[PDB]
Amino acid sequence: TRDQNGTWEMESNENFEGYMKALDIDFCTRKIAVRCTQTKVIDQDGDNFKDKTTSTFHHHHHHRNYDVDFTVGVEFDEYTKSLDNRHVKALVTWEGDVLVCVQKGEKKNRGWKKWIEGDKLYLELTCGDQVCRQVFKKK
Amino acid sequence: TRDQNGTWEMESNENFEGYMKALDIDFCTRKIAVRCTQTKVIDQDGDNFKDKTTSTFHHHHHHRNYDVDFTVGVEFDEYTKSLDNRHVKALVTWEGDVLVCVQKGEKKNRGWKKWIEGDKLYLELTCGDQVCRQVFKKK
Fold it and tell me: Which positions bind all-trans-retinol (chains A, B)?
């Protein structure tokens, strides 16, 4: 038969990494590719083809949670799962209306600052000379 | 203000990759983490804080689509966004009931074969001596 019309869900996929290596895809892109499911929607009219393929990434911990409880001024041990899984000794204090934390440990100049402005929560995470700024909106 | 109580949806995330490198997070982990948004639920009771942060994947990163329109026997230009981002000249012919394609370009023996067997779509992708065999079920 020649009629390839339909919606097709991938059922089996073998030597997908061998083929991608032959095309020089890097290790990381392959590791993301083999975690994708594929749907193919084929519209065929004689010898005219419309082939639409959808790759969906499926990562475990698609909804990962990280919980930290602390009191201002009370040093606590933090295990930075969700990031680098290191042990730091963390201490949170107020500097004005800015919540400031120092994470003493292997990394020097590691810590963060958290504050409110308007309807938004600002967070800046520091490690050495690298600052990451994140902004959150109130729901 | 000091009141950080609320549910906070991430709106922006700047130099997150720079920060993760400073923490020695590996490249592939960084590449996936930068695709995530997070919701932060802060329950603040004086100077005691419970911070539950949830990481989920963005929505535009939930799936990539790759669209190909072609007519049997009419060479067409393909840019393989979903794989190796190369330019090939593609030509599809029938060989029996098998839709056979040759992708002329940098890679030798690059092409694919598609055919129906039962209610199943078979796809074999070749590059050199590497063959990827895929089977699709009709949805």
Answer: 40, 114
